[PDB]
Amino acid sequence: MSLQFIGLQRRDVVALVNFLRHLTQKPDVDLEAHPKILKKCGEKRLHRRTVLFNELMLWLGYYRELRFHNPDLSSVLEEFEVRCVAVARRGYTYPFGDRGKARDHLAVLDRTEFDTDVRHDAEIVERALVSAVILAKMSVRETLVTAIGQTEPIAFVHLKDTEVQRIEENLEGVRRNMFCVKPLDLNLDRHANTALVNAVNKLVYTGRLIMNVRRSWEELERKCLARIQERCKLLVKELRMCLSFDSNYCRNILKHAVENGDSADTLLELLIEDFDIYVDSFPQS
Amino acid sequence: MSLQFIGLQRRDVVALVNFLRHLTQKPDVDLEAHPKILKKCGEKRLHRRTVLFNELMLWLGYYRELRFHNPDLSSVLEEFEVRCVAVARRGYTYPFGDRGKARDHLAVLDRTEFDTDVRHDAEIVERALVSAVILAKMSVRETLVTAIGQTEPIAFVHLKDTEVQRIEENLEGVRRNMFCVKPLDLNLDRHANTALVNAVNKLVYTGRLIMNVRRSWEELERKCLARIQERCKLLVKELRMCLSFDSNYCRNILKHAVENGDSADTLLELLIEDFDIYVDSFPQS
Amino acid sequence: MSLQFIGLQRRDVVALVNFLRHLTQKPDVDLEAHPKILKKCGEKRLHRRTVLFNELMLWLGYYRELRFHNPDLSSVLEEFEVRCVAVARRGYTYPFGDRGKARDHLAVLDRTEFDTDVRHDAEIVERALVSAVILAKMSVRETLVTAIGQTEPIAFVHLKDTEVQRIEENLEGVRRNMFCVKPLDLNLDRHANTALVNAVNKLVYTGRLIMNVRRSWEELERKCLARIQERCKLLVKELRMCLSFDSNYCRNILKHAVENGDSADTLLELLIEDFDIYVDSFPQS
RNA sequence: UCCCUGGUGGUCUAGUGGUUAGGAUUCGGCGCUCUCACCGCCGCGGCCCGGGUUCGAUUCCCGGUCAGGGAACCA
């Protein structure tokens, strides 16, 4: 439906709705990143119960938008598979000091594939990148870290400081707004470096992209669910004070547990559809 | 260049000219769906000759507009192929009762590519959809059509009835206005369904969209050509009724049969170019 | 900007500094080609010593601009190396009448590398091109120069006359203004001569582009050095006419030899810095 | 090489620190007329993008944008 707020003026309702409609465009797509939108809720200007209801509705709409856009990186996954295979071939051609030890990493790179679950996908990419970078480091005769518990740093190899700085800025930017992805003019491939190194660096860039998108989204969803649950519990603590028909009705709506954004959809739709019945409880303005 | 209408007042003429451009952005893009525009032609008010001439002009302009817009779906089938590869990617590791059947379907799914011909595109979509629905149904251990000559019906799996109604209505709207497609408010993803089931639902939706656009265009072109061909025969009889220079000239223009889209364009251009020479024939007001 | 002119008006100094600022944008990047600037530098109207000093300043500025805007053919150099590797790849496979001769020339093609120095680049490209052209001549059974103290000329083999004309015009243009390198021409046909011949032809084009750029730049530098030396000598005579402290200071500044553009920058800074103490010797207005 | 303007529905466009952003406008439907030209009727319908200023701004500052004006070699 359309979000229903208790005490907000039209000026604030339109702003809260415009922040949601345009959530993709804004950099730093995080509700907390914008304290002004939370201020539009009526905190310190409205009754506490109305403020809690407003924040619950806001977080529900925000979580709904988040799940709706929900970037599916089908083509990035396609590219990661290709680049993983390319790293494997360039490695198998290359001659190593200990072909056995490089064989473990070439095998880990061959057995890599995407599972049915997506979170597994983020973990898969990370574990593959570790081996790929280890291989590239061995190729240049650099000494990889062998301290136990200091597995490995995923990093580009034989790239000038400027390029690494630009690429890190790009990946951080994707971290802030996952929904919008920008192509890179700067090219990781360099004529000086070995072809194995160039393949490794391209695979590393794509894997960092996948990992950042997936992890950032999962964290946003976790935070949204936690905020929603806090708001539900506190609002119920408040509504339990008055035993009116409509107050009991609002609590009865809120009884549902809000885990599993499927529950979020059901809760939001139940809130909106029966709004006229329980709205008299909250004190407007 | 502009269409020429014998009897009408400049007002109605401006109305028809506005209609032709508005066609691109309108629900129900079909001339016969709008009785008012056709009646505005001058039916039963003017002489039958003039009504026939005006209707022929309107149908020629309408066909010109449809053929000119004529949506191109190259992006959409390119997206369909990626949707297939994503379905396959989620399908591979899932444990199946008969890996032989699952692997055959995953292979049919991967090798899917679109031909340059459009009709081949419709057949491709149908085959890929049958294969993907079979894979998803097997994933959930539901029974399938074992009969000979029978094939599984294309349907969404593990979706609420209300969501199915919503998407059915949306695809109906796409059928009404093939040029403009409205993004659906709903998202096909569900937390209960696995990644494979969600991928299959999205693939089903995009394939349904493709075939709907294709069939709608086919029917529209068929009706346009039939209506034009009827108007020409009727008008030729009416003109044969009267022997004059302008009447004979218009009949001579109407001799060559328009059974094509280019034949219609030639007819429209020739019938416009000589409007002044033969106009006097048709009685006005 | 830093350039100091004795007797010029504000507008003419602005014109000279603007001409140097916009140097690369103008076609025919050569001062001698642009007469209006050189005449405006000083003039017949101004005194001889003043004219000589003004020409010294203009030439020093022009040399500084040339040396700052020298070309950095990093990408073209990498491309030449890639095409050399390609010619070597297709040389070993091709069946030859006497493979020993081919193997000598292939060995020569295989060592080719670019040192840090830009001056070495033309010498490297020439050796590589001679070897490749001999290889292509052997492949097609052409007669190759065998005379004592004679070398094969670098030319395209089995190319159309029109394509040769187009490329020769492009290379003449590059000779005109080198800072602009736009090598966009790859018109070879696979059904044409053969893989070896085509690879050799592309290599020839890139080598010609590099050699032309380098030679044109070096010629400009040589002319600048000649002009600067002549200005210094004539001015030193004119100043030797008078034995003032100021004239002695101006002479002592002009002792520095302007070969080795580093010396040119030394002279430019020395003139600009201490202008106050010796400007009195120069008559102005 | 310089500065100077502007973006407000479906074009065109007034406003112009808290306003449910308003105009003709087409559109659609009321067709009440030979056709509606009367629209006599509504209704849908819109904040250049992002950040930043206070209690709160499309409406103020800073960047980016796209369209423009006139200023640089030629001008």
Numbering used by the authors:
A (entry chain 5), B (entry chain 6), C (entry chain 4): 1 to 285
Give the authors' words.
Here, we report sub-particle cryoEM reconstructions of HCMV virions at 2.9 Å resolution revealing structures resembling non-coding transfer RNAs (tRNAs) associated with the virion’s capsid-bound tegument protein, pp150. Through deep sequencing, we show that these RNA sequences match human tRNAs, and we built atomic models using the most abundant tRNA species. Based on our models, tRNA recruitment is mediated by the electrostatic interactions between tRNA phosphate groups and the helix-loop-helix motif of HCMV pp150. The DNA confining hexon channel is “secured” from the outside by β-herpesvirus-specific tegument protein pp150, whose N-terminal one-third (pp150nt) is resolved.
Using the sequence of the most abundant tRNA species, we built atomic models into the tRNA density. The atomic model consists of four leaflets—acceptor stem (1–8 and 65–71 nt), D-arm (9–26 nt), anticodon arm (27–43 nt), and T-arm (48–64 nt). One tRNA bridges over three pp150 molecules, two of which interact with each other (pp150nt-a and pp150nt-b) while the third is slightly farther apart (pp150nt-c). These interactions only involve the phosphate groups, which introduce less selectivity than base-stacked groups during the recruitment of tRNA, indicating that pp150 could bind to different types of tRNA as shown by the sequencing data. The set-of-three pp150 proteins on Tb, Td, and Te match well, and above those triplexes are the highest density of tRNA.
